[PDB]
Amino acid sequence: TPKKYNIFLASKPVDGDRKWLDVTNKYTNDVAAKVPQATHKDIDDAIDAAVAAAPAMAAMGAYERKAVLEKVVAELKNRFEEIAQTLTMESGKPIKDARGEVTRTIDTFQVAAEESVRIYGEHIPLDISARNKGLQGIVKKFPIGPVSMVSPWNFPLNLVAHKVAPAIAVGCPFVLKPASRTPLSALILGEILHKIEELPLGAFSILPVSREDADMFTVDERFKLLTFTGSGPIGWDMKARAGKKKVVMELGGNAPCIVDDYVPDLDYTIQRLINGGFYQGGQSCIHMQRLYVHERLYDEVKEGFVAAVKKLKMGNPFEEDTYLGPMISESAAKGIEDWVKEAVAKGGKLLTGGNRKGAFIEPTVIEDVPIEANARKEEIFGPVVLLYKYSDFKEAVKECNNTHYGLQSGIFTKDLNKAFYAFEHMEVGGVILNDSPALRVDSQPYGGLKDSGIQREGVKYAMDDMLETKVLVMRNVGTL
Amino acid sequence: VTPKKYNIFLASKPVDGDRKWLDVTNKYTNDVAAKVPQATHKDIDDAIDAAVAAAPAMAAMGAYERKAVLEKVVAELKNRFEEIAQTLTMESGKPIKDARGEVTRTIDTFQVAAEESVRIYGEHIPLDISARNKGLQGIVKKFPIGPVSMVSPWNFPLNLVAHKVAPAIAVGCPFVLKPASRTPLSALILGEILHKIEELPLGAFSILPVSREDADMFTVDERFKLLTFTGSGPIGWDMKARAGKKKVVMELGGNAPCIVDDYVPDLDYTIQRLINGGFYQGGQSCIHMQRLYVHERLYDEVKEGFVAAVKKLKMGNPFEEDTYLGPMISESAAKGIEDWVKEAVAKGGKLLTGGNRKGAFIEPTVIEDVPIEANARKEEIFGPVVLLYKYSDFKEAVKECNNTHYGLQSGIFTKDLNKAFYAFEHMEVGGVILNDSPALRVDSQPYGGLKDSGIQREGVKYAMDDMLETKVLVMRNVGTL
Amino acid sequence: TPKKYNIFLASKPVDGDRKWLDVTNKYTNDVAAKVPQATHKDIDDAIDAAVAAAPAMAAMGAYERKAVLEKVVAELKNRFEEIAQTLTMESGKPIKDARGEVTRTIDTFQVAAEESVRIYGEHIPLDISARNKGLQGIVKKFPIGPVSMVSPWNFPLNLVAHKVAPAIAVGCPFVLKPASRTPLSALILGEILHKIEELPLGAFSILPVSREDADMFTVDERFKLLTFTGSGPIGWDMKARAGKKKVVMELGGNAPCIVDDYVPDLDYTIQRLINGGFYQGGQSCIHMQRLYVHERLYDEVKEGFVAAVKKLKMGNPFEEDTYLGPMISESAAKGIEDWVKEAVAKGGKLLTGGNRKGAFIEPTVIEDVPIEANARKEEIFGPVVLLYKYSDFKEAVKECNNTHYGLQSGIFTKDLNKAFYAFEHMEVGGVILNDSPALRVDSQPYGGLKDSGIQREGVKYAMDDMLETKVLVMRNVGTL
Amino acid sequence: VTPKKYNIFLASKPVDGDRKWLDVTNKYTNDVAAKVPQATHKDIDDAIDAAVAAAPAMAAMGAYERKAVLEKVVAELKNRFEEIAQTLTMESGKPIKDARGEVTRTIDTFQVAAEESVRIYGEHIPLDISARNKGLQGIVKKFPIGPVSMVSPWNFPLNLVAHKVAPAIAVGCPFVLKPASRTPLSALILGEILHKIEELPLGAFSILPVSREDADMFTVDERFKLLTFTGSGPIGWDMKARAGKKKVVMELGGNAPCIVDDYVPDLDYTIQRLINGGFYQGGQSCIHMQRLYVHERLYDEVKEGFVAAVKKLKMGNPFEEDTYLGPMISESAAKGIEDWVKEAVAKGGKLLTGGNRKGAFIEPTVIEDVPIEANARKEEIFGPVVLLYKYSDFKEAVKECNNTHYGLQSGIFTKDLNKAFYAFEHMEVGGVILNDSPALRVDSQPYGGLKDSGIQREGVKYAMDDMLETKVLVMRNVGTL
Ligand SMILES: NC(=O)c1ccc[n+]([C@@H]2O[C@H](COP(=O)([O-])OP(=O)(O)OC[C@H]3O[C@@H](n4cnc5c(N)ncnc54)[C@H](OP(=O)(O)O)[C@@H]3O)[C@@H](O)[C@H]2O)c1
Ligand SMILES: NC(=O)c1ccc[n+]([C@@H]2O[C@H](COP(=O)([O-])OP(=O)(O)OC[C@H]3O[C@@H](n4cnc5c(N)ncnc54)[C@H](OP(=O)(O)O)[C@@H]3O)[C@@H](O)[C@H]2O)c1
């Protein structure tokens, strides 16, 4: 029997006579949850409630915002396994990775609780020249207002947290539209926020609707900010239709990694390349898509990496030992199988995997795939790694940048000048030194260059986009 | 006499060739005083390609090189002070006092930038926030965004170009600037200064004064990583909608209000600042004090003193030292102000002074109790018109100040501690001016609007931030032997 | 029967064959606790253990320091009433004020836990001129090393916390010498720290010794910093004998308060002046010693204030209703009685109190006391308030500054320019606007000017004095 | 010829009167080249009273006024460049190349200060961290500390005075400067520049070059709120002990080591920087590379190349362009270095080059494997002597670098990422120089020592911090109507 969930409209749980949206177990492909489908009126009413709640949200004391975020931390810790099991069920990700996501979410809210009592301003001298004699200023930051949040399926809890936690830390009311396939994680967050008394009424609304019903999340003038996490083409089109509001875009990536050395050793290096290339079956925005290995290490790395790929346990995501579960859908898995076949037909040498069994697709390693192939050009978002050899370091950095994406890059080096050359010249938001590009700390500035997006997430950075600058220009204040 | 022939800038070099001429008129005599080469579609496309090609060299410059470029601009602006001021007055119609003031403001803008170019700090961040993240540390640095598209208005043809150009050089961003067709000379004199600086790489700048019908690329072209616009609200918001992937900075219009709750320090000084706010540059300012709210107990005393000071304002030739207000940018603009004054009076407003038009010249006007349905109250007037209102409750006056689709700046005259900070907290603007009119701006302050007045902030260190992208180096056990 | 406590030597509880130091109930004057007396060898061994523990303390991860501080927060909350009762017993302060001190201590450690994961550095460009081409720098902060801490009797928990919490937040080993009369609060802290596994061995030592045995805390070259909280003459002499080490001095005060308006009303104003003048029987460093009231409000304030002073409940500090308990000693109470008598003999008009009953001394208000009197010149540290009338605001600010102290000042004003004139011209570390000078937030920079001290406490500010700056000057790093 | 008569500064004015003369010798010819008035006990007492009296006016100055003062110093230093450089060489004995370099460094120090004077930022802090603190907010501002006592050494008589004087003016602190008796002219030329600046209040400065026996007040006097000293360790530490209540800044000696683990970018450049480190100003520097640690695999190649470069160094008249090293400050100082070289060799050290003395001149010396018991290894040499050592393990070389009671700067030549950051983490110094000798200093960097090398940091923005006191305005429900 499927579990009946509630949606959140103006901080309140609702179900009423709304039609049901089915949420399937991505492994068994059977309906495990029933979620109420929100209407156009529900969205319009949620936006009006957020506008009405904006003065009360802005009026809250720093300690009140802190108390709200600390209560979320407490409840997440208390419902840890329940959330992890739900995460695995609705996304198809292994249980160890689902537990990791709950731990990261706890850290996200904890950082936000600490940052809520730290929104500093400036006292600025304004008597920079003779005509400005007797002028001083106070620069303070104020909430932007109602926030529109649109999140993807791959991290249905932590990527919602990277939007929700900064909004509460600042005092911004919001309306969240989670991914239809993975809404449960966002709804459990709504269940936690609902029973917090310090959070004013209408501060939040969580409405899981399909993309053809969620147009207001983009265009509506009542939102002062749109924060989107998802695919590049969808995001860029949303920015174009957004109107006057500010925009934050967390989009796709085609992440490369340079291996110039083994740091600290070969076993650890391969263990981190495996993580980058196949964490969550490569269904990550910072998945290590491309691997560039120096010629003197090429054969030793190729042998060790391929052997480690073949050793990866694929199956039921509920099992502890499972490294990679199934893809979000059979359709997604078919697309990866097609792109692997095309890459091989275009000149690529298939080292391992490439075969499909329903929603399951084998961990794949393809050598020397040309730029004309979709597997090299476009974001794969699958358990596929593209192997390349290089002889000159400068040319490898140029190859890393030979993409329309620019999220993160990785570099394995014991060399001081190579490490800083890569930091200077890699056209990304984040350069990972002596780890794969798949590394993210929740406090770091995270975001992309080029088609990977605009602006930065990471709690204190996301809070900045949710804050507007105001200056009090004071003329001879203190003159009796 | 004979008009002065100017040169346009394409990939850091002056050009004229066989291009057709664009006439620049003396806004007072209405006679052609300058001839500017008209840039083509190919000229714009070539300027954008040169900026893309110059981006690696611009990014490779040392901080001292960027500072040296900006300090050379400061030196040359000081040396050509009167020449620039006379040109400014001629092409815009603003009095020489207000023009000299703009050159001084521009010198400070480049000077602030020179100092900020050697102060782009980064962070060393601990990343071992939890057990999972043991042995992690980070270096956060800021890098130039890339080619910048600049579109500037007519009213401050030098200082508002400086607020874009100076941060771009301070950061190391190549740019393509499209100044206003009516006022391009100020931007072209900047090009003449920049052209002589050897430290600034080739293709770092291009200054192409083209009409709005030809400047579509400045908005839509994917080769620009940022579009920074200063101008009218409807034009700006539409440019943001057509901009594509690039980041956007919007410095748009305003309907600035001012509360007079006390005389600070005295009545004479208060009136002197209110006059400045209401009639500096004949209200052809984005921070022009369009609305004046005076507490009932001071109302009659302020109304008498203010109106008497308005009637005493010297209007005429902007080249004369004593001239407080010159003509509007065009006769068409002056006619529109005359129409809105007439409509405001017909809708119930009480005309206290002015309201009459003599060609491009429009008398300093003060209209009492104009309703919200009138265009003079609803929309940005951008003329020498001040709307007078009385209030009894301070909280309600702040609510009235916020009763606009604009939100650039507001002003407040108060001796009260709690009123000063209540206004700072509740005024829906980018800047609250305390014991001065909303018409005050310091070139180092964060400047920009809320609502329809825009997005993002200018003021050198703030504009530089929009021209910089954040990059983090995440270090795993760096320093472990 | 008195409770037998343990002292802390190299993180370990010790008692052995050490002689006992008696701790009396400051109300009943009967021995309620027995504390082991530390020897010269104990102090020398504690300093050697701190030197030996400095590398391990410096090697700790930010999250480990955070975990230590969060465990202190948890334990303080769990032993709340026990600590409060102990605080009241050993100091003589009312129970409501003892509870307030435990709450402030919890906030101090909580701020320190948050600040431990926020020790930021800078990336600085160093190519400021042509000769410096290709230079860049990384500025980082490192622990100073072993810290010597000497704390007073009046806040035996929170003032120890304002030293201990920043030391742990930074990773500095320490040796604490609490006040002999009030050591229990510091020893309960030692009991909490002892059972924390993440804190290395030898990180702390709490040795309650008399002033004639604690010379090493001042002079010993093994300490890199001396942080003292206590009386001016003792502190200044300790700075003179300190040697090479850095010094932090939190000393006495003669705090004034200007009443130019009633903010928001007269009742609230008097309620805050009462707090300032008689919180903890004026036995505070920020006690409102001097009150300057504008002539137009003088009589209305004088009447309302005196009536509120006479209404104050004095007695058993264990009783809930008690506003002020007894003085630390009968000797201290006698000294206050002598200074009140002298102030009246020198021309002062006694409005209320002035009488002594053992260790108890009545809340006193003395009008127009001359500068030659000890009650006006020197820090009173008693329930005595000196009332003065003024006609000109500028002259009142000049009178506020007419002292050799400079800790905090207070100002009640509705005037914008008076508020900022006072901020600009009051020669203090803190100006309290629309509250008495007796207000302190644990996150604010706190300290004095003139004889009131040097440096600033308040968690993030105290951490700075416990950190040394190091720059990595990089020449063409990133050049292949 | 005839000696040049100089004037001392007392309460911003030049004075000579009937005061006895102090002779200043040309450190190369050993002949009297200048006559300086000797300040009295009353002169010092009067200078301190004038600084106390000038503190309110100094604190009242606008940020633009302080910047204007510093920019006028920059202009005058540029205008008198060669004159100052020649004076510097004459009174100190340093080569003209090193003197010109010091004037350029001083120009940058005042320029950094001019920019920092208009950038003293404060904070707006939320204080409602808990329920108890509801409605609390704070404004944290920094205010001048008050009168500053300055004591400077002989080796950099201009730049080290600038590192005290420039931050004091940038903040608005009056001061009394006691420069070294042997090198006072550089400080007196600064006084001549300052005296002509109208924006700087009267009594803001006094420059009194007196002998150490007469300058006790500079240490003990309670009218000074800060003592900033640059000089020898034993003198400084004793001054800190006698200072009383005032804050103290100590810039003392060093025994700087350098690790050569790789050639960066090549061997020639590495040797060129090691020579700079070991013999710039004949080792009469606080960041002189006294100790050189070379990895065993590079040892012989470096030892041969370094010794050959030492023998090629031009020693002689500091007024000559080609001169790398001039004479020591005195013949007495040179004799002491000769004695310590002789002792180092007698204790087991292998003399590779130099070690011979010709009056005030001492040959550039390189001594191999000198034991810890020798004075040349234990104590600061402050001469043209470099102690060569071989190492096999990097971790042990860092431990050897730290095997000193000093801790100013260290140097490291490495291409290795983890070695570079291991050294940054574990070197017990204020500054770690990566791919240069420890003798590198940028005037904007935080500069100072650990252990016996001092307390606090110089570098303009860091020195300003020690000259500023923190004040918080704690606001209870400000903005509540
Ligand atoms: N940069 C980062 O931090 C980050 C992190 C993780 C993932 N990603 C990127 O996200 C992608 C994977 O997520 P996804 O497959 O869920 O992406 P997606 O198809 O773009 O969808 C993301 C969200 O947008 C909604 N949406 C789609 N079209 C919409 C429209 N026209 N109007 C309004 N909402 C609309 C979706 O709703 P429905 O599902 O209800 O249709 C979903 O909630 C990859 O490209 C990955 O790189 C980026
Ligand atoms: N600025 C602030 O934040 C702050 C806060 C609270 C209090 N205070 C000031 O502290 C004073 C009240 O405290 P108190 O009466 O305890 O002060 P105190 O007599 O100066 O003693 C403070 C501490 O110093 C110790 N001590 C005294 N002489 C010493 C010496 N020669 N060598 C080493 N240690 C020595 C004491 O030990 P024994 O008790 O064991 O002898 C005690 O632990 C007042 O003046 C008050 O203003 C300042």
Distance D239 CA to ligand 2 centre (A): 26
Structural contact between residues C364 and C314, judged by C-beta atoms closer than 8 angstroms = no
Tokens of B448: 């920009």
* Alpha carbon distance A6, C84 (integer Å): 45
Nearest-CA neighbor of A167 among A125, A122, A135, A199? A199
* Alpha carbon distance C404, C388 (integer Å): 19
The pair phi, psi for residue B215, each rounded to 5°, is: -95, 35
CATH number of the CATH domain containing B129? 3.40.605.10
A69 membership: H or E segment, kind and range = helix A62-78
* Alpha carbon distance D411, D424 (integer Å): 10
Residue recorded with tokens 């010149």? C377
Structural contact between residues C8 and C205, judged by C-beta atoms closer than 8 angstroms = yes
Tokens of A168: 């509460």
Residue B154 DSSP code: S
Q: Which of A431, A434, A468 sits opposite B478 (nearest CB)?
A: A434
* Alpha carbon distance B50, C318 (integer Å): 81
Kindly report the nearest CA distance between residue A98 and chain B, in angstroms: 15
- Cis omega (within 30 of 0) on the bond before C166? no
Query: What distances in angstroms separate CA C281 from CA C313, C323, C325, C353, D210, one per listed residue?
Result: 11, 8, 7, 13, 53
Tokens of A476: 């001879």
Q: Which of B394, B421, B478 sits opposite D478 (nearest CB)?
A: B421
The pair phi, psi for residue D250, each rounded to 5°, is: -125, 110
Q: C165-168: long-range contacts (C-beta < 8 A, 24 or more apart)?
A: C165/C69, C165/C72, C165/C108, C165/C109, C165/C111, C165/C112, C165/C459, C166/C112, C166/C115, C166/C459, C166/C462, C166/C463, C166/C466, C167/C466, C168/C65, C168/C68, C168/C69, C168/C72, C168/C112, C168/C116, C168/C199, C168/C203
Query: What distances in angstroms separate CA B258 from CA B255, B261, B433, D419, one per listed residue?
Result: 10, 10, 9, 62
* Alpha carbon distance B388, B400 (integer Å): 12
Q: Which amino acid is at B331?
A: E
Beta bridge partner(s), residue C78: none
* Alpha carbon distance B93, B282 (integer Å): 10
- In a shared domain, residues C105 and C123: yes
The pair phi, psi for residue B143, each rounded to 5°, is: -120, 145
- In a shared domain, residues D401 and D293: yes
- Across the interface, whether the CB atoms of B480 and D424 are under 8 A apart is answered no
Beta bridge partner(s), residue B293: B259, B389
Phi-psi region of D244 (alpha: psi -120 to 50; beta: other; left: phi over 0): left
The pair phi, psi for residue A475, each rounded to 5°, is: -100, 115
Nearest-CA neighbor of D262 among D382, D96, D435? D435
Beta bridge partner(s), residue A256: A290
Phi-psi region of B316 (alpha: psi -120 to 50; beta: other; left: phi over 0): left
* Alpha carbon distance A205, D396 (integer Å): 61
* Alpha carbon distance B432, B258 (integer Å): 10
A277 membership: H or E segment, kind and range = helix A266-278
Structural contact between residues A456 and A462, judged by C-beta atoms closer than 8 angstroms = yes
Tokens of D332: 């007495």
Q: C interface mutation test: which of A397, A475, A480 has the most C CBs within 10 A?
A: A480
> What HEC string does D105-161 produce?
HHHHHHHHHHHHHCCCCEEEEECCCCHHHCCEEEEEEEEECCCEEEECCCCCCCHHH
Nearest-CA neighbor of A230 among A221, A222, A239? A239
Cβ-based neighbours of D127, under 8 Å, separated by 6 or more: C441, C443, C444, D133, D136, D137, D138, D474, D475
- In a shared domain, residues D98 and D18: yes
Nearest-CA neighbor of D57 among D145, D173, D142, D149? D173
A294 membership: H or E segment, kind and range = strand A288-294
Residues of A in contact with C117 (CB under 8 A): 114
Residue recorded with tokens 């009542």? A222
Neighbours of D440 (CB within 10 A): 23
* Alpha carbon distance A429, A406 (integer Å): 7
Torsion angle, CA of A367/A370/A375/A378, rounded to 10 degrees?
Answer: 140
- In a shared domain, residues A427 and A326: yes
The ligand minimizing its distance to the Cα of A255 is 1
* Alpha carbon distance B246, B227 (integer Å): 7
Beta bridge partner(s), residue A172: none
Q: B interface mutation test: which of A226, A472, A474, A476 has the most B CBs within 10 A?
A: A472
Beta bridge partner(s), residue A366: A350, A386
- Across the interface, whether the CB atoms of B121 and C125 are under 8 A apart is answered yes
Tell me the residue length of chain C. Answer: 480
Residue C399 annotated as lining a ligand binding site: no
* Alpha carbon distance A34, A43 (integer Å): 19
* Alpha carbon distance D63, D67 (integer Å): 6
Helix axes D63-79, D96-117, angle to 10 degrees: 160
* Alpha carbon distance D119, D122 (integer Å): 9
Tokens of C25: 């109930």
CATH number of the CATH domain containing B371? 3.40.309.10
- Across the interface, whether the CB atoms of D473 and C131 are under 8 A apart is answered no
- Per DSSP, the three-state class of B133 is helix
Neighbours of B104 (CB within 10 A): 18
Cβ-based neighbours of C189, under 8 Å, separated by 6 or more: C72, C157, C160, C161, C164, C206
- Across the interface, whether the CB atoms of D140 and C431 are under 8 A apart is answered no
Torsion angle, CA of B237/B242/B244/B248, rounded to 10 degrees?
Answer: -20
Nearest-CA neighbor of C283 among C347, C349, C343, C336? C336
Residues with CB under 6 A from ligand 2: C 150-155, 159, 177, 179-181, 210-211, 214, 217-218, 229-231, 234, 250-253, 285, 379, 381
Neighbours of D56 (CB within 10 A): 12
* Alpha carbon distance A32, A11 (integer Å): 25
- Across the interface, whether the CB atoms of A63 and D141 are under 8 A apart is answered no
- In a shared domain, residues B170 and B28: yes
Q: Which amino acid is at D155?
A: N
Q: Are strands B431-434 and B289-295 parallel, antiparallel or unpaired?
A: unpaired
Residue B280 annotated as lining a ligand binding site: yes
Neighbours of C275 (CB within 10 A): 15
* Alpha carbon distance C183, C7 (integer Å): 9
Tokens of A317: 């995501």
- Residue C291, domain extent: 253-441
Structural contact between residues A287 and A408, judged by C-beta atoms closer than 8 angstroms = no
Residues of C in contact with D420 (CB under 8 A): 472, 477
- In a shared domain, residues C319 and C270: yes
Query: What distances in angstroms separate CA C384 from CA A40, B379, C338, C351, C366, one per listed residue?
Result: 69, 63, 12, 11, 7
Nearest-CA neighbor of B149 among B8, B286, B247, B43? B247
Residue recorded with tokens 């005050």? B440
Cβ-based neighbours of B312, under 8 Å, separated by 6 or more: none
Distance C151 CA to ligand 2 centre (A): 6
- CA B320, B323, B329, B333 torsion: positive or negative? negative
* Alpha carbon distance C276, C253 (integer Å): 13
- In a shared domain, residues D311 and D391: yes
Query: What distances in angstroms separate CA A124 from CA A365, B346, C10, C396, D140, one per listed residue?
Result: 56, 46, 47, 28, 11
Catalytic residue among A70, A75, A90, A250: A250
Q: C interface mutation test: which of D52, D262, D276, D472 has the most C CBs within 10 A?
A: D472
* Alpha carbon distance B405, B237 (integer Å): 13
Nearest-CA neighbor of C160 among C230, C223, C225? C230
Cβ-based neighbours of D447, under 8 Å, separated by 6 or more: C471, D251, D430, D431, D441, D457, D458, D459, D462
Q: Count of alpha carbons within 13 Å of A66, Cβ hemisphere only?
A: 20
Nearest-CA neighbor of D258 among D422, D435, D426? D435
Q: Which amino acid is at A435?
A: D
Residue recorded with tokens 């393809």? A366
Query: What distances in angstroms separate CA C188 from CA A209, C45, C82, C86, one per listed residue?
Result: 56, 21, 10, 10
Residue recorded with tokens 């006609």? C391
Nearest-CA neighbor of D433 among C128, C138, C124? C138
Residue B458 DSSP code: B
Nearest-CA neighbor of B275 among B234, B229, B325, B317? B325
Residue recorded with tokens 């994917």? B222
Ligand 1 pocket residue status of A283, Cβ below 6 Å: no
* Alpha carbon distance B398, B395 (integer Å): 5
Ligand 1 pocket residue status of A391, Cβ below 6 Å: no
Structural contact between residues A279 and A313, judged by C-beta atoms closer than 8 angstroms = no
Structural contact between residues C336 and C363, judged by C-beta atoms closer than 8 angstroms = no
Kindly report the nearest CA distance between residue A324 and chain D, in angstroms: 34
| Sheet with C174-177: strands ordered across | C12-14, C7-9, C204-206, C174-177, C147-150, C225-229, C246-250, C453-454
Neighbours of C2 (CB within 10 A): 15
- Across the interface, whether the CB atoms of B141 and A442 are under 8 A apart is answered no
Nearest-CA neighbor of D4 among D211, D184, D206? D184
* Alpha carbon distance C250, C152 (integer Å): 10
- Across the interface, whether the CB atoms of D118 and A140 are under 8 A apart is answered no
Tokens of B472: 């983090």
Nearest-CA neighbor of C287 among C307, C304, C301, C273? C273
- In a shared domain, residues A77 and A119: yes
Beta bridge partner(s), residue C56: none
Residue recorded with tokens 């009126």? A41
Residue B389 annotated as lining a ligand binding site: no
Neighbours of B311 (CB within 10 A): 13
* Alpha carbon distance D176, D224 (integer Å): 9
Contacting chains of C (3 CB pairs or more, <8 Å) are A, B, D
Nearest-CA neighbor of B48 among B245, B217, B164? B217
- Per DSSP, the three-state class of B460 is helix
Query: What distances in angstroms separate CA B292 from CA B263, B268, B275, B365, one per listed residue?
Result: 14, 16, 11, 13
Beta bridge partner(s), residue D177: D150, D207
Nearest-CA neighbor of C426 among C402, C390, C454, C453? C402
H helix intervals, B93-158 = 96-117
Distance B239 CA to ligand 1 centre (A): 26
Nearest-CA neighbor of D149 among D216, D59, D234, D69? D216
* Alpha carbon distance A440, C426 (integer Å): 48
* Alpha carbon distance A419, D416 (integer Å): 10
Structural contact between residues C406 and C452, judged by C-beta atoms closer than 8 angstroms = yes
Annotated binding site of D: 105, 152, 154-155, 178, 181, 212, 232, 251-252, 280, 285-286, 380, 441, 447
- In a shared domain, residues A70 and A164: yes
Q: A280, exposed or middle or buried, with CB in 10 Å at 0-12, 13-18, 19+?
A: buried
- In a shared domain, residues B354 and B213: no
Distance A153 CA to ligand 1 centre (A): 7
Question: How many domains does one find in chain D?
Answer: 2
* Alpha carbon distance B162, B460 (integer Å): 9
Catalytic residue among B71, B91, B116, B251: B251
Torsion angle, CA of A305/A309/A313/A316, rounded to 10 degrees?
Answer: 130
Cβ-based neighbours of C235, under 8 Å, separated by 6 or more: C228, C249, C250, C251, C453
Query: What distances in angstroms separate CA D437 from CA B97, D262, D423, one per listed residue?
Result: 56, 13, 14
- In a shared domain, residues C364 and C431: yes
Q: By what method was this entry solved? A: X-ray
- In a shared domain, residues D200 and D92: yes
Q: Is B251 a catalytic residue?
A: yes
Q: Please report the number of interchain residue pairs, chain B to chain D, with beta-carbon separation below 8 angstroms.
A: 35
Q: Count of alpha carbons within 13 Å of B116, Cβ hemisphere only?
A: 23
Tokens of B441: 């701006």
* Alpha carbon distance B68, B169 (integer Å): 10
Residues of D in contact with C413 (CB under 8 A): none
Residue C450 DSSP code: G
> What HEC string does chain D produce?
CCCEECCEEECCEEECCCCCEEEEECCCCCCEEEEEECCCHHHHHHHHHHHHHHHHHHHHCCHHHHHHHHHHHHHHHHHCHHHHHHHHHHHHCCCHHHHHHHHHHHHHHHHHHHHHHCCCCEEEEECCCCHHHCCEEEEEEEEECCCEEEECCCCCCCHHHHHHHHHHHHHCCCEEEECCCCCCHHHHHHHHHHHCCCCCCCCCEEECCCCCCCCCHHHHCCCCCEEEEECCHHHHHHHHHHCCCCEEEEECCCCEEEEECCCCCCHHHHHHHHHHHHHHHHHCCCCCEEEEEEECCCHHHHHHHHHHHHHCCCECCCCCCCCCECCCCCHHHHHHHHHHHHHHHHCCCEEEECCCEECCEECCEEEECCCCCCHHHHCCCCCCEEEEEEECCHHHHHHHHCCCCCCCEEEEECCEHHHHHHHHHHCCCCEEEECCCCCCCCCCCCECCCHHHEECCECHHHHHHHCEEEEEEEEECCCCC
Distance A232 CA to ligand 1 centre (A): 8
H helix intervals, B196-330 = 217-220, 233-242, 267-279, 299-311
Closest ligand 1 atom to residue A253 Cα is: 47
